[PDB]
Amino acid sequence: WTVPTLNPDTPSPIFGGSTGGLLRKAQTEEFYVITWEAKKEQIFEMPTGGAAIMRQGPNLLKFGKKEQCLALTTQLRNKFKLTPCFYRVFPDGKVQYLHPADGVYPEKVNAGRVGANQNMRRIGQNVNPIKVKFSGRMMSPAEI
Amino acid sequence: EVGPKRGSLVKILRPESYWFNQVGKVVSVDQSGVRYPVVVRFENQNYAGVTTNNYALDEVVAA
Amino acid sequence: GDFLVHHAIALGLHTTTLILVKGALDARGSKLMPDKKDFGYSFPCDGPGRGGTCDISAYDAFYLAVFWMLNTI
Amino acid sequence: KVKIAVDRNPVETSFEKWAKPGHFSRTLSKGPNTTTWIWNLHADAHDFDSHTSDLEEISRKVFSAHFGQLGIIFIWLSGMYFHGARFSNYEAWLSDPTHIKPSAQVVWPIVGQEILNGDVGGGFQGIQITSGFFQLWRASGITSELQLYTTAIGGLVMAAAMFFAGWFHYHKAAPKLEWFQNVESMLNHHLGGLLGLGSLAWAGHQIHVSLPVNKLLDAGVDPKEIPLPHDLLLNRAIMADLYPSFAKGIAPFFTLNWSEYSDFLTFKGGLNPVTGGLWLSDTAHHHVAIAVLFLVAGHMYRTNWGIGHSMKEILEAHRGPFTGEGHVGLYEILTTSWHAQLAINLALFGSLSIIVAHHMYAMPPYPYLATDYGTQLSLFTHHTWIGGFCIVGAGAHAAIFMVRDYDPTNNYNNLLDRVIRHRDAIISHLNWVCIFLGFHSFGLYIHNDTMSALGRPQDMFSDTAIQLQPVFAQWIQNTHFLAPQLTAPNALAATSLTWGGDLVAVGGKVAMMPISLGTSDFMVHHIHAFTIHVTVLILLKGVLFARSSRLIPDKANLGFRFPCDGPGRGGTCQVSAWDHVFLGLFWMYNSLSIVIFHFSWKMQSDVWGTVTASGVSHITGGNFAQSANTINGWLRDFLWAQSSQVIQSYGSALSAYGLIFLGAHFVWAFSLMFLFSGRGYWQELIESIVWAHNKLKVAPAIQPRALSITQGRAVGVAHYLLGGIATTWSFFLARIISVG
Amino acid sequence: AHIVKIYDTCIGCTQCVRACPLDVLEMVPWDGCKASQMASAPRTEDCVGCKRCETACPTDFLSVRVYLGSESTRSMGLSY
Amino acid sequence: DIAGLTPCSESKAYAKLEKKELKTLEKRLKQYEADSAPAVALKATMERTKARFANYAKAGLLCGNDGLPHLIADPGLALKYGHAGEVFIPTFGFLYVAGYIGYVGRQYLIAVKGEAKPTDKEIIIDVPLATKLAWQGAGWPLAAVQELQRGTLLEKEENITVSPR
Amino acid sequence: QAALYTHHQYIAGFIMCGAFAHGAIFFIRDYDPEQNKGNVLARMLDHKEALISHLSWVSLFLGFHTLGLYVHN
Amino acid sequence: MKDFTTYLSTAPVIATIWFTFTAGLLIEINRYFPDPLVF
Ligand code: CLA
Ligand code: CLA
Ligand code: CLA
Ligand code: CLA
Ligand code: CLA
Ligand code: CLA
Ligand code: CLA
Ligand SMILES: CC1=C(/C=C/C(C)=C/C=C/C(C)=C/C=C\C=C(C)\C=C\C=C(C)\C=C\C2=C(C)C[C@@H](O)CC2(C)C)C(C)(C)CCC1
Ligand code: SF4
Ligand code: SF4
Ligand code: SF4
């Protein structure tokens, strides 16, 4: 498996448009682009509101935030058993692949993945806030 | 076979546990070296609706 | 008449104290949130999980006590 | 093929389930482990959709639940007729309706409560009623407690039949889904049978009983010597004496000589001078026309013959260049979704209940109803409140459909889809309209309050200072008033005296007179526009964003009734469509509270009042025009001044209204505890209380739990509306009964 | 960004990972529980603070804990 | 007597209030014929009013300047001056009934706790057992002392759950 | 006379609310259990349920009876 | 019949019956001993 390259000229599902689409953020900060393959033309629900028809084979959509892309990712996988992938795109042309990060959906344990933000203790073993006081800034005993 | 006997009643000692100072039934104790091998079942559900939890050998006492 | 109003004042003083005291004693933790101390004095909530946890912070107790204090005064 | 289709002995009639609480739910049937189960059991008892995914089973539950409601309503009516026959002063009131106060509730002498049995008149002591039953029974031609007792027995026989029908159509012969999905047949029977036949039958009773009996009553004939209804039904000579055309029989009807029946079928308009109510001859010709119109309407939809229309064809035919597919998919949505039908039916039924309040007050249909101000105010306010509640319910079930029954595969490029695709345009535009109305409606009141406080009355908006006259409503009033001579030639008089003309006085009191509209009326009509627009904004937004929003893209998965999505994204508290209904209730209450206050002050100030020699003295002396243009004016001259009756009711028969007035202020304040607090605090407090119960070995097996977030909101709004509406109720009834 | 932490009490149910609507969590190989897997939080920068993960966590007490922290365009879940 | 109050029996305001009350009822009794049911009812209320003013005075209640009976709650003043049926005796009457309800309910919860489904016995009441405990609750006070003395009334702290502290 | 009494009684009420607010903050930010082991302060936390449950009982009694007597009257 | 008696033993039913009994008892007492202010 290799990091996929986003083809920006992919056909987009049939949809007349809505008022819940991208805003100025897509042109100044960043936007998200979901891509998936459809084995048949099926009408689906746009997370931004409205019905849309997925096209045979390749499909590409752009959303304002990552949650909207993952929301559509959930519907396609749970209802149509499809396997979509999405990326974060910056206004300078840079593209960043996001999900599935390693090609294996996160819920399925995969090798190579290194644990992060893990504490070798139970929450009841956290120190009292008095111990983490006067540190560089407001922090929680959990962060230590 | 380390751990309390299956079917025995033990009292939880974990302070942040909903069943602290409460008695549950030993469902099973994992002989493999897991951090918390004692599976305990309780009649009263917690705030999440759960009625079972895993505890370490020290977190449980026959009662 | 003075007897009845004085017991009403006692009602307000004990209730406002109950709200304030309960907030200070449960400020470091409760059965619903055992690690409340790790979240600080003022936090929105701990989410809808565990049955719901709106107004669980000690700051939320003070906010509720002010209504009872204004009612007492 | 439209046909009767049913399943035999579908459900066994046993008490086995009666002894198993929560049997209807897969989650609740497991029994209670915490107190939340008890609430969940009652909250999910009538949610059949959530009980089962079978539409036929849901439809059978709905049909039988309706028979149960109909049986409940029949018992209620039988009680009202029974209390009119055994615990009332109706027979005395029939002889002296201008002085005797209607009463049909007598209290037992205990703990000193007998004081509530006021001296209503007619040698009777009881609680004064404002339901208007006495005037309805007089209009129907009832002259004896025997007739009221017989109708009461009939209603109980009907209630027993309704409960039987409910049991039979669910346990013995349950209609199949195909039966319920016969919308074309259902509309034909409800328009032709229920409505047209019902109106025709009522015309029969009015022409053969209501008209002669009431004509004799108005002529001064004692109720005892009036012929019994059957005597009039079996003798034509008596009816011929009262109405000459009856001597010709039904020949004129079949010979198209309808003009002969002009003596009982009339178009007088206006009000009967003796009673102050609409002419029964006008109500008779009306119900006859309604009956004919609805009999025709009930022959429009196709059933088992080729003639008739197909609702699906009509809908699919109505499509234009700006609306994509158009009304495609609606027939399928309105034949497979009860929540969709309930949404439309609740919306229209509430709007109708509100229209009834305005029409019944301006055109008082019952004899001696207009001069009974307690009944008039009660009727208008009651039907206004029922309408508002139903309108909010319409919003909730529209969101329930959008969340549970909406399928995009059946709604592509249709009106519904295109509405959801421009929801942000709709809500944002409505948002601005609400802000504009708010400033240009309530801002005018603030300007006046400040100008008056600053001693600058000439700079205020008033009929003497700057004027904001409702010219359009003034022109319509003039048009309707002059209608009889040009646009409505046959009519003797205008439909209502509100439009203009001479006033009608009965018993020395004003029944109805012209209602003038000035700056204060213009200002309060715009407050209504603002309050309604804002309430729509909340309800509409809740329905359009029920499935998803820019903040939450999977709201539909979370469901219709959910507390929030957590404190993330800044805080997602109250994002569910259910929460929009919760907020809509408060604005609906604010709007209708202002509407009923407007009605009471305007009527007490400019319409109601004793008619004396050369002059009519109104209850509030016409102070609405110069006192309703400021908030201070409303608080002082309305709330503070008219609260004197309720605050001074102790030691009298209206003492109950004083107690309810305080009790209602209490329930309202008690709601704020639930509305301003959160379950997190209560759960912890319960934990310390549970500790005391554990210490003394008195802790319950069913674990005590704080109310759910949604339950907390539902309890708060309920007590808020109960307290607030009851407070106005006590204030209104005490005030009107005293100065009626 | 909000602080998300996993505790040794984790049983490797993967429920939190399935409940997360922004892909902040994943399952990594582990030897502390029978499931031989433990939840990890390598993308907390995309966390909004919904606390769905905590609602899905069945351990007593929670094995996954969210501490609301610095607010960003992603943390506030803003599409603008 | 106490607090500068005066016996209702010797208060002039108490007497004026009784006349004021009977005069309202009489002003109304006029508009009705003598045997009319309304007249009979107003007469029975007037008789009940006369009996109340007389019964209250006979009970030795004290009246303030308002001419209304005031209740003495100090056990010492009530017993020494004949005012114990006002707050003292009522206190022991209520305490007996309230403890009765509590002890029976506690006995019920304890009995159903040893069953298969205690929660079921709380939504569906074991009527026979409930009636038995209801009758055996008359001797609750002695049972409560006997439980307090055996150390069976309270629970050991070690068996009661609490928060982390 | 009226203004001074009401003014000082409302300022007093807000200050009392503030006092408990800071007591709750103290417990969360400064309280160190190890340095207060066995002391009167730690004892308070050890019987917080008793303290709160008793304040709950008193408030309930005053509320039910003070309201009940006004309503009866 | 056993199931019917179990339904009559349900919390709400028993509450209605018990409260109706208690209310009735108090009402009858005040009906035969009116205006009881002191013992
Ligand atoms: C002795 C006659 C009888 C018997 C033995 C049964 C027995 C049964 N019925 Mg049933 N039913 C009957 C008459 C009867 N029914 C009648 C006359 C109707 C027409 C209304 C119905 C309509 C009906 C429906 C639609 C359904 C059942 C269902 C059931 C089954 C489970 C529900 C249940 O009964 O729990 C007991 C329920 C109750 C005791 C609730 C009582 C409801 C009353 C009418 C409400 C009264 C409210 C009151 C007027 C106002 C309260 C205000 C407040 C302030 C006090 C069960 C085996 C359900 C089923 O099939 O299982 C899923 C089902 O959905 N019945
Ligand atoms: C002349 C034909 C006729 C009439 C008069 C009615 C009348 C009524 N129907 Mg209806 N219906 C009809 C035909 C008719 N239906 C047909 C052909 C179908 C199949 C397509 C349906 C399917 C249907 C459904 C699904 C429902 C109704 C409902 C109702 C009631 C609504 C409540 C109301 O507003 O009225 C006010 C109430 C009254 C005025 C009380 C008087 C009612 C008496 C009994 C009139 C008799 C009506 C009945 C149809 C006559 C046959 C009875 C016979 C079988 C013994 C109402 C009484 C609702 C309901 O649940 O009712 C229980 C409802 O949900 N109907
Ligand atoms: C539901 C509406 C309704 C009803 C029920 C009636 C009923 C009646 N109207 Mg009437 N009317 C109505 C509306 C109605 N009207 C309206 C809207 C108008 C305005 C146009 C009028 C204007 C009007 C006038 C001017 C007159 C009547 C008259 C009458 C009466 C005589 C009818 C007649 O002459 O023969 C009608 C024929 C029949 C009714 C057929 C009878 C069939 C029988 C009942 C069937 C029995 C079958 C059974 C098997 C027998 C066995 C019995 C058993 C014991 C074995 C009658 C009681 C007349 C009257 O008042 O008489 C004094 C009259 O003068 N009406
Ligand atoms: C024909 C009218 C109608 C019908 C048939 C329904 C039917 C239904 N509604 Mg609905 N609703 C209506 C009108 C109607 N509604 C109106 C007018 C409103 C606006 C207020 C609502 C607002 C509404 C909401 C917000 C919800 C429903 C829900 C439901 C569904 C479940 C009901 C339930 O929760 O059971 C249980 C019913 C009860 C427990 C009754 C509660 C007791 C009431 C509310 C107290 C009212 C005060 C009372 C009179 C006080 C008496 C005096 C007191 C001293 C005792 C159900 C299919 C629920 C749903 O769809 O599930 C997702 C839901 O959430 N409705
Ligand atoms: C619960 C609060 C409370 C309060 C504020 C009072 C207040 C009072 N009580 Mg008292 N009392 C109480 C509870 C209370 N009591 C209870 C629960 C009992 C049941 C045993 C009694 C039994 C009682 C008796 C027998 C007497 C009083 C008396 C008095 C008055 C003078 C008593 C004294 O000197 O100091 C205040 C008293 C207390 C704080 C506690 C109890 C009272 C003590 C034990 C009685 C000692 C009285 C002493 C002889 C002083 C009076 C001298 C002389 C006039 C008799 C005083 C206003 C005396 C009185 O005025 O009678 C005419 C009296 O003799 N009380
Ligand atoms: C000597 C007195 C004193 C001192 C030194 C402090 C000091 C402190 N308090 Mg504090 N407090 C006090 C009294 C005091 N308090 C009293 C009397 C109360 C009861 C009302 C409180 C209740 C309280 C709470 C609930 C909290 C604090 C907090 C804090 C800490 C930071 C909060 C802060 O100051 O940010 C800035 C404060 C503000 C910007 C004020 C907010 C604006 C309010 C609503 C006033 C607005 C009124 C407005 C102008 C009215 C307009 C009317 C006009 C139009 C006519 C800080 C160390 C916070 C904390 O613990 O830190 C986490 C906190 O949660 N205090
Ligand atoms: C008028 C409004 C109101 C009322 C009456 C109350 C009353 C109460 N509050 Mg409260 N509060 C309010 C507003 C109100 N609050 C507001 C606006 C807030 C800010 C959100 C708070 C915040 C608050 C907090 C934080 C706390 C309270 C607490 C309490 C309770 C204190 C103990 C007590 O006095 O017991 C007396 C009991 C009563 C006064 C209730 C009377 C009994 C009823 C009326 C009799 C039954 C009537 C009839 C038989 C049945 C009616 C129902 C019918 C359908 C069958 C008390 C019942 C404390 C508490 O929970 O107690 C432990 C507490 O922690 N309140
Ligand atoms: C047995 C019983 C129960 C009771 C259980 C328990 C443990 C109750 C606890 C009681 C405790 C700890 C009481 C502690 C202190 C009580 C004190 C100091 C007593 C105060 C009473 C005073 C000062 C008397 C005041 C007056 C008297 C003489 C009577 C009246 O004249 C009025 C007044 C105020 C003047 C269960 C389970 C609730 C179930 C049910 C039956
Ligand atoms: S509704 Fe309550 S739990 Fe949910 S986000 Fe708001 S405060 Fe938190
Ligand atoms: S709080 Fe929400 S976004 Fe953050 S890790 Fe948990 S589920 Fe994911
Ligand atoms: S839900 Fe809890 S126990 Fe399950 S994998 Fe996530 S952190 Fe571990």
Short mmCIF file of C-alpha atoms in Angstrom, two decimals, chain D residues 385 389 392 531 534-535 538-539 574 578-594 668 671-672 674-676 712-722 725:
data_model
loop_
_atom_site.label_atom_id
_atom_site.label_comp_id
_atom_site.label_asym_id
_atom_site.label_seq_id
_atom_site.Cartn_x
_atom_site.Cartn_y
_atom_site.Cartn_z
CA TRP D 385 -54.57 28.41 23.23
CA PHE D 389 -50.46 24.20 21.00
CA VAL D 392 -46.33 23.79 17.75
CA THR D 531 -44.10 36.98 17.73
CA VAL D 534 -40.16 34.42 15.38
CA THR D 535 -42.04 31.29 16.58
CA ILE D 538 -37.58 28.46 15.61
CA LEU D 539 -40.01 25.69 14.50
CA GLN D 574 -30.08 21.98 22.23
CA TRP D 578 -37.06 18.31 19.75
CA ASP D 579 -35.13 21.18 21.47
CA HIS D 580 -36.48 23.58 18.77
CA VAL D 581 -40.05 22.49 19.75
CA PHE D 582 -39.04 23.13 23.41
CA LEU D 583 -37.97 26.72 22.53
CA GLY D 584 -40.94 27.21 20.13
CA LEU D 585 -43.38 26.51 23.01
CA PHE D 586 -42.03 29.55 24.96
CA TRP D 587 -42.45 31.91 21.94
CA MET D 588 -45.89 30.41 21.13
CA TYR D 589 -46.79 31.15 24.80
CA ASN D 590 -45.34 34.71 24.50
CA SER D 591 -47.27 35.35 21.23
CA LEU D 592 -50.68 33.99 22.38
CA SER D 593 -50.29 35.59 25.86
CA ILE D 594 -49.97 38.93 24.06
CA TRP D 668 -44.24 28.99 36.96
CA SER D 671 -40.24 25.49 36.42
CA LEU D 672 -37.21 27.88 36.53
CA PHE D 674 -35.56 22.76 36.10
CA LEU D 675 -35.05 25.22 33.25
CA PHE D 676 -31.91 26.93 34.66
CA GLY D 712 -35.40 18.20 32.64
CA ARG D 713 -36.24 20.48 29.66
CA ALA D 714 -39.69 18.83 29.17
CA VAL D 715 -40.60 19.19 32.91
CA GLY D 716 -39.47 22.87 32.89
CA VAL D 717 -41.52 23.91 29.81
CA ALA D 718 -44.62 22.01 31.09
CA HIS D 719 -44.59 23.80 34.50
CA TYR D 720 -43.77 27.14 32.77
CA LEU D 721 -46.83 26.91 30.46
CA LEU D 722 -49.05 25.40 33.22
CA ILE D 725 -51.45 30.04 31.44
#
